[PDB]
Amino acid sequence: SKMSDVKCTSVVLLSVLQQLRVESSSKLWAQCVQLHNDILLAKDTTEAFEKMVSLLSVLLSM
């Protein structure tokens, strides 16, 4: 299903961001953690995709 794979992609994306020393910046890390937590608790697929896209854009920025 799309829910499980989008949650797994969000988890791996946050892992990559953590390995990218994103935790050095407090606000960026807070935003990433909030987006990830919302994705995992998201019950609607569209919102999960929106937050996953936001996290992917954060990753692409650096």
Binding site: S1, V11, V12, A30
Partner: protein
Amino acid sequence: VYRAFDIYNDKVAGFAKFLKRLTKYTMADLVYALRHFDEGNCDTLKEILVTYNCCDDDYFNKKDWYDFVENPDILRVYANLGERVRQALLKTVQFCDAMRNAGIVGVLTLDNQDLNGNWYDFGDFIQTTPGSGVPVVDSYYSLLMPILTLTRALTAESHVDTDLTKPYIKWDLLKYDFTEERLKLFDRYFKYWDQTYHPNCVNCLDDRCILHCANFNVLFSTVFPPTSFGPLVRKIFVDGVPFVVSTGYHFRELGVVHNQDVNLSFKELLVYAADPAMHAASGNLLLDKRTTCFSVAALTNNVAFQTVKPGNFNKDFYDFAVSKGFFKEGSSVELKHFFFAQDGNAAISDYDYYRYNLPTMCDIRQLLFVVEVVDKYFDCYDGGCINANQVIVNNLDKSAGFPFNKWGKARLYYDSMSYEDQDALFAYTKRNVIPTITQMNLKYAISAKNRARTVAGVSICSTMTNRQFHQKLLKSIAATRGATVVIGTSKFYGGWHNMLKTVYSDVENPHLMGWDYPKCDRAMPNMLRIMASLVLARKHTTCCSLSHRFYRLANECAQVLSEMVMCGGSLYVKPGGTSSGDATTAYANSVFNICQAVTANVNALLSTDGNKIADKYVRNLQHRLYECLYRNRDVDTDFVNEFYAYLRKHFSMMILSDDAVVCFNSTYASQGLVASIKNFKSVLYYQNNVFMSEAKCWTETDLTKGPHEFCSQHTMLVKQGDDYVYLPYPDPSRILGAGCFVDDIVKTDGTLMIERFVSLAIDAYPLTKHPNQEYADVFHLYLQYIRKLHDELTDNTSRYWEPEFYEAMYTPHT
């Protein structure tokens, strides 16, 4: 209409709602409303809160207003009553004085005191010689005890000349001994409490006296400045060098305690290092606005922020599950358990939750009777002190606490000191109080909630001494089968079925019930923790003297109840509660659970009409319960035994830490003879200071189905060898989340870890018998993935993917 009355006569006794200028409501109505809380039926509480300008009607439109956790502002609303309550107390004393001057002997009840403080009852009054009148205030003060702290009546005492309008009284910072103030407060408020009150618990005759003095001290401590409480330190000259060393402790409940072996070796090095005095003296002043708790000092030049990393993903297992048809659209089984990352402010924020722990004063008579009843539940166990050579530690690779964590683990400290040094340290703790520092860390677990979880690691000395003190009893409790406490009883090899059969032992109309304690660790009152510690220390009748046991209790309070807690390199004062790193964390929680259950039963029985009860035995039992509660000081062993037998017959209990499962008689609960969910709700409301929601509680009408949930496991009746047997199965989501998500990256590689999935299959095997097919497909998927992992790694290993090995683990053979 119906009004709350506390009645005593040969026919009936109890505090209950009876069908039957002066204000419309009396004090008894207020106490009944605040001690018997029903969310649906708050009419009396709402009207009392509106007529006396506490909150407007609009306040009740907001939902969850009664809940403290959701709406802490309610604490303010109740506080608006406190002053009035205080006035009533003063008036009561005046009334009592008059009676002594009138030579009048009688009993005083809340029923006869309007909420304005006036007393309008002269009945049950027998004239005697003038100046010899002796009022009975046990029931009155006992029942009114909780409201005083809940309404914060004595707040006015914190002002100069006891007026809220005028500014606060400014006590000298150096001052710490408030014994005279405590005596003055007792003489002004509880002048007619005949039992002797000791401001310092070190002069207490027995554990019951200690409980009484601590109950009064909890109320009296709120007035005094917070900074006064805490470790007491002095400067001494050692080897021609100044050292700031602790020489006492101020407890909000035990008063001032002074070390007996104060003077001015490796053991003394531990005593000095564990003492927060040196660190606090050498630490810079700190002010933290992120939390409402008191801040001590800062031991680091910069604040430290810790974060929780994201969970690692096992691509192989998820792909394997997907290929096998799992995790499709609309499937019942889904991922609901994950590793939840947290920001740098999480730890401190969770510590702020300790704000939910409020000063709580308990009905002393009720608490005494409840602890007497609870002591019966722990009679079979054997406890006492043991030497260092008899101490067993499961794991030594753990942390030793601060500053002990900087230099090594527990192996270092246990090897450094010989058994003689440990015995000397234990003896010193039996004579002096050693404050310690406990470090809070964030635990990396697979939870289904976004909230963070913290673990408290206490100092090495605290763990060592608490072990030497309590390990015999702890192991005795863990080594029994068939008792109320089911710690140490495994769920495998038919243990689940044996336990469930034990609960069902002889119940006329068996019905099952369960509950959980909201914010159990944070909201646990200090008085109940002290009671649990005393209950666990009662086993030291022959080994330890009164002074030794009192000093052990003081050490426990200073190392668990109210200690210095390090978060991010900053020291704070813990308001109260129970620490997560205590040696007796689980057993103290079990004692607290049993105490709450007994209190709920007592309240349920007394709240009954009595006249309506058609059973002579139960009516007489209620009458004698009131006798032993609010009329007899000495413990009645015979009635305690009778009440314990009654509870066991009509209230079988499984208790583990805070989780509980009760089998009770439906008819008795319906008639109010035994506690129900509403009784537990009320108990937690007026004692635990937390609102209990019915959504999280479950009640089962059919014993065949079994408990809805216990230890996060569900019960199911299957067929094994022509015998119907209860087995426990977990939520498939939890097992699947454990399989897919691992904390470390090595566990992601399936080849290295083939035992994780073996254990998860040993846990998920019972799902194979579930009517739902996907639940059994979970176990089959685990078996197939185990086989695939073995193939990738490549006779013995066959048993891992053959189901007989997992089936055998649930057979009563072993």
